[PDB]
Design a protein around this ligand. Sequence first.
Ligand code: FE
Ligand code: MG
Lengths: 211, 197
Amino acid sequence: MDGVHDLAGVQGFGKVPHTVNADIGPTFHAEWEHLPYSLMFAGVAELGAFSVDEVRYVVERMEPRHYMMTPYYERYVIGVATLMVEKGILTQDELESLAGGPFPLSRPSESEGRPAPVETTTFEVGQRVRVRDEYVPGHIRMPAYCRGRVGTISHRTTEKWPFPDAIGHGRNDAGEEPTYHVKFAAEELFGSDTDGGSVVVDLFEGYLEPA
Amino acid sequence: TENAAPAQAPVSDRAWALFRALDGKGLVPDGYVEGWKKTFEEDFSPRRGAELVARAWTDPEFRQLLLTDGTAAVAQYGYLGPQGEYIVAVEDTPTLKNVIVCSLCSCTAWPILGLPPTWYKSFEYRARVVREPRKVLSEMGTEIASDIEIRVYDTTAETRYMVLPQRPAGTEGWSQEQLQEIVTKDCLIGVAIPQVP
Ligand SMILES: [Fe+3]
Ligand SMILES: [Mg+2]
């Protein structure tokens, strides 16, 4: 999904609000902040109602201006609540009654997702690969800066996982694929307009093709 | 107004409403969220990654395991966990500085780095460090010379990373505890270099 959440490479932001080893304060800075992760794991591990990938996608589905003005942990309150309503476990009515006020949720998905691709290749370390020039309106774990670009394999994982573009939609056809550490030169991703050296993206097999 | 925020109840009230809606239906086991809060606050910690770095710095055999099968190395300490089940450690060298981000959200090796800090989840870091990591680190207080390659790892799938920083001069002969003390959270994320007094 080419949403505002795909922020790498966006220009115009100011300083990162940190200097090295500065005080970051407690793990939680308000008494509710442990609830989004905790209730995510209840949903995943206790209710079996959704996957972690579906949490990433529902946060991607926040209305874009809503995403941009909402603090991190509140985005996950909104996302987990949205999933609980979408999966039939809760209603928005009861959430607003308990909350005492409006509780707008993420927007409905505009894609049913897609299966794990049928034809892929097992790549070896050192091989050159290109990121498939594909547009996916639902969930995908490919930041757009690497779409269509060429890099080299640094690592093939020794484990496999369900394809995000399927399991992020709760589909039954996510299969399993390894992922690859793909090293891109900074100039391949941003031309002259970078001060970096290389960028390594961890890309599912189904996002890649031989160069 | 145009582009105005939607009306919303205070976030605390929304978050506790989500809790009560689920707990009222018997879907949240007793002590379940309190259990997680304690795990997040007390067990997941950058002191674990510091311990791993200090071990690597004084034990070449472990250093080699950590760099080739980070999962196995971490498991020897019992530090695998949620968002830290497949670990890859990346080593800094005299010509290479590694830095980690999740540009798409906040993915972090929770059990050995701790939950990410607010700044790591900021739009500023997420947007900028992939494209201008040298300038970002400089602004953050870390100068990386022109002759050093910077390599940014974007945590886009299930690999969870930790940086193995270079061991600084002036620590020869230190004990593992002494070494652990100068490996901070920011060292493990890669935006800081360990400092010697
Ligand atoms: Fe993330
Ligand atoms: Mg975009």
